[PDB]
Amino acid sequence: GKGKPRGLNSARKLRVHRRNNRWAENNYKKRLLGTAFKSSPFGGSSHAKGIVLEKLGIESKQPNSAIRKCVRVQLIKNGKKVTAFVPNDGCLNFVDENDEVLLAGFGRKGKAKGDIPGVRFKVVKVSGVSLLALWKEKKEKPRS
């Protein structure tokens, strides 16, 4: 029969066996260990707001040649320092330093995205004003 007990009373063994083998599932393992709460910069939450320390020049991976504009951010609720990407064109002109920014995931479930090495987050808002909006003409960046 190849392995699994086919008996009518063997329910225990069949349960316990699945229980054991779930741990080989990456998603199941993370969920129970509480990896989100323990590791990872966000508290497990969807976004986290933080503060800009310096503006990085991160150079793209191969076979790409570029300089990807990014910022080192210190999450408020944490202290955890994190480097995040500032999307589209310019927009690194919108940020500067000691500014408040809203970080979001990159979509890849951890796992930095493109040719950009080691960057797992991206900037959504600065000074409460939403990079997108700034980028077209729609809004303007506040006083101080």
Binding site: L56, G57, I58, E59, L92, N93, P117
Partner: protein, 60 residues
């Protein structure tokens, strides 16, 4: 690898593309009428069958 690269060129191309203004155009109908406008365009009279069909043809 390298982390501090130059930030000077940020925004380069967007800042140097020559601006051309949006040109004023007939206002397209919103709602059912647009669906209608599509229907009669896509199906009823059609346009050109050349080789199969074409939706947004250029200088063909």
């Amino acid at each position: 690898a390298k982390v501090h690269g130059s930030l000077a060129r940020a925004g380069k191309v967007k800042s140097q593309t020559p601006k051309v203004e949006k040109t004023e155009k007939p206002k397209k109908p919103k709602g059912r009428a647009y669906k209608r406008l599509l229907y009669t365009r896509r199906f009823v009279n059609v346009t050109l069958v050349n080789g199969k069909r074409r939706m947004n043809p250029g200088p063909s």
